[PDB]
Design a binder for these strands. Structure first.
Ligand code: HPA
Ligand code: HPA
Lengths: 338, 338
DNA sequence: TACGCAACCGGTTGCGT
DNA sequence: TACGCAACCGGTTGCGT
C-alpha cells in the first residue's frame, strides 16, 4: 500500500517513506502531495513491515503473575504509563505461577520479538530460573526479587526485610509484646522477606512468637479472614497483629469485626503495601508503604537502558519502604514502661 | 535464520517451514533433522516475518480507560485469560478518558495491525465517536455502552438500568423511603444508567429524592467519602443510601464510621458491582453484582467471530445484573406497614 | 539540488517434478 | 513419493545521479 501512496503522489516509495519519517530533506510541494496521498488513501503504515527491517518491535512484554490484585494492578498501571510515554506498546501476560503457562508466554513473547521483558513471577523455582536464562538474549528486568538471583538480568530490589523490621519496631515502641503474624507465601520475597525483617526486630527485643500465633496467608482477603480468626480464636491471644499485605489485612479486619472484636481497641493491626484504598479501610489502615510507582518506572528505565544503550552487565537498583501511620494501631500494655 | 536451519538440516527452508507448522507431509528422518537443527540452533521463528505474509498478528488490543480500578482490573484479567487460551496476545492500552491519548493509542494499535479491538473508554463524546469509525476496518467490540451507539461495532450491554431498579426496590421492600444516592459520572453508562434504573423504582413508589440527597461520585473511594459525609452532614438525613459502585461505597463506609455512624444500624448502604473484595468490606457489602467475567469472555467471542467468521453486521449481546445480599442493609421504618 | 533503484528483512506458499 | 524454486508480504536504506 506504500506503493499506492507513492503512485498517487507521483513519486517513489523511498520518497513516501522519507517524508513519513522525516528522515532526509524533501521539497514542500513534494511533502504536501504525499501527505495528501496518505490522506485520500487513508494510509496507515505497517509496523510489522517496518519492524521486519529495522529490527525492533518497539514493544515490551510484562510476564506477570496475576493482574487483579491491587498490588500487581498498581504496578502494572505504572509500567504502562511509562511505556506509552516513550512510544512502547505493552503486552501483558499472566502465567499464574504456572511453569507451562510461563514457558508458553515466554515463547510467544520471543516470537513476537519484544524489545525487552519485565518479569514478575512471584515465585522462582530452578525450572523457572532456567527457562529465563534461555532468553538472556532478549533483554530483561526481574522486578520482584529480594536480592539478585542470576547474572543474566536486571533487578530492582525492595528491601522487604527492612520493611518487615520497620513494622515490628513500631509495634514494639507502641507498647506491644504479644504479637502475631500472618505472612504471605514463604516462596516469595514479600512473603519470607517481610517476615524475617519482622522477626529480627522481635528477637532483638526478646519477644518470642508462639507458633500458634503465626498464620500463613496467600495475599488474598480470605486468607486474611481465616488467619485473623484462627489467631483470635485462641485461649491466649495477642494484642497486636502484623499482616503480610494490605488486602489480606483488610480480610483480618472483617473477621475481627465479625467476632465483634475492636480495631484497634481489642486488636491493633499493622499492614503492608499501602495500596490505593487502605486509607479507606475501616479503620483507615496503618501500614508499610511500598513505592509501587517508582518500582515500576525504575524497572522500565533499567530495561530502556539495556535496550538503547545496549548495556550488557546486570544492574540492581534498590527502592525504599516507609511507614504510613493511620488508625488501626493503638498503644499497648508496655507503652509507659519504656 | 530459517535459512540457517534449513542449511544445518541439509534441506530447503520450505521444508523447514512445513515441519514447523505441520502443514504438509514430511519424512520422519527429515522431520527429525530439522528439529535437531532448530535445536542446536536455538531457533525461534519470527512472528513478525510470519505475520507479514499471513496477514494477521494474532494479537488483540484493549483500548481501556484505566486499569487499577477493581472493576476494570477484573474485566481485563478476564479478557486476558481468554486471549491466552486461544493463542491471542494482548495489548493493554489506557487512554484515561483523553482524546489525544486515545487517538494515539488507536493509531499505534492500527499500525501494529491488531487482529481486533476491545473498547472500554467509559465516556463517548462525538469526537471519540468519530475516531472510532475511522477504523471500522479493524474489527471491534465496545464493551461498555448501555445500548448500541453506532452501527460499525459490536456491543455487549449490561442492563445498568435494570440493576439500578433492582437496588431501589430492595431498599423499598426493606422498609425505606428516605433514601440517598451517590451516582457515578453521568457521562457514563454505569453512571446515568444505574441512576435512572434506581430513580424509576422511586417514582414508582411516590418516593422523591431531595436533591440535597443525591451526590455525584467519580467511582473513586474519596468521592464516596465526601458524598457520604455531605449526606449525613445534614439536619434531615436518609435512612438508606444507594452507592453507584463498590469502591466509592467502601469510601462511604469509612466516613460514616468516622462520624461514628453505624452501618447498617444508623445507615444502610447498598452498593454496585460486586467486586472481588466487597464481601470483605466491613460490614460485608450488600450490592448488585455485574457479571464481569462473562462480560469479558462474552466480548472476546463476539470479536473472534468477526475476526474468524468474518462477520460484517454488528451484533449486541446483553448480560444480566443480580442482587447479592450481604450485611450492610437493615429493615427500615416501613417494613411492617407493607 | 532533490530525489529514485533495487536489495534486503524472514518468513510462507503455489506450482513443479 | 517426498520435497525445492522463487515470488511475494510491505516497508527501509545504501548508493547513485
Ligand atoms: O507476592 C505478592 N503477591 C501479591 N501481592 C503482594 N503484595 C506484596 N507481595 C505480594
Ligand atoms: O464507569 C465506570 N468506571 C469505573 N468503575 C466503574 N464501575 C462501574 N462503572 C464504572
Amino acid at each position: 500500500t506504500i506503493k499506492d501512496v507513492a503512485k498517487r503522489a507521483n513519486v517513489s516509495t523511498t520518497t513516501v517513506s522519507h517524508v513519513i519519517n522525516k528522515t532526509r530533506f524533501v521539497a514542500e510541494e513534494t511533502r504536501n502531495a504525499v501527505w495528501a496521498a496518505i490522506k485520500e488513501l487513508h494510509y496507515s503504515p505497517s509496523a510489522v513491515a517496518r519492524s521486519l527491517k529495522v529490527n525492533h518491535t518497539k514493544s515490551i512484554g510484562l510476564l506477570a503473575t496475576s493482574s487483579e490484585a491491587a498490588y500487581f494492578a498498581e504496578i502494572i498501571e505504572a509500567v504502562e504509563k511509562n511505556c506509552f510515554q516513550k512510544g512502547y506498546t505493552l503486552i501483558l501476560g499472566n502465567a499464574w505461577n504456572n511453569l507451562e503457562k510461563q514457558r508458553a508466554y515466554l515463547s510467544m513473547m520471543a516470537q513476537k520479538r519484544v524489545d525487552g521483558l519485565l518479569v514478575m513471577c512471584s515465585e522462582y523455582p530452578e525450572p523457572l530460573l532456567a527457562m529465563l536464562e534461555e532468553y538472556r538474549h532478549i533483554p530483561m528486568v526481574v522486578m520482584d526479587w529480594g536480592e539478585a538471583k542470576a547474572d543474566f538480568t536486571d533487578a530492582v530490589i525492595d528491601n522487604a526485610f527492612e520493611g518487615g523490621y520497620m513494622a515490628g519496631r513500631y509495634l514494639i515502641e507502641r507498647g506491644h509484646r504479644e504479637i502475631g503474624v500472618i505472612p504471605g507465601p514463604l516462596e516469595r520475597n514479600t512473603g519470607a522477606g517481610r517476615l524475617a525483617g519482622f522477626m529480627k526486630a522481635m528477637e532483638e527485643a526478646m519477644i518470642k512468637v508462639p507458633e500458634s500465633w503465626i498464620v500463613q496467608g496467600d495475599f488474598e482477603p480470605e486468607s486474611g479472614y481465616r488467619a485473623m480468626q484462627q489467631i483470635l480464636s485462641q485461649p491466649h491471644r495477642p494484642t497486636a497483629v502484623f499482616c503480610g499485605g494490605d488486602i489480606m489485612a483488610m480480610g483480618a479486619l472483617c473477621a475481627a469485626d465479625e467476632m465483634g472484636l475492636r480495631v484497634p481497641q481489642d486488636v491493633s493491626l499493622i499492614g503492608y503495601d499501602n495500596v490505593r484504598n487502605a486509607r479507606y479501610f475501616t479503620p483507615a489502615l496503618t501500614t508499610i508503604h511500598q513505592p509501587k510507582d517508582s518500582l515500576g518506572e525504575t524497572a522500565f528505565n533499567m530495561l530502556l537502558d539495556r535496550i538503547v544503550n545496549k548495556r550488557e552487565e546486570p544492574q540492581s537498583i534498590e527502592v525504599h519502604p516507609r511507614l504510613i501511620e493511620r488508625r488501626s494501631v493503638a498503644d499497648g500494655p508496655f507503652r509507659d514502661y519504656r
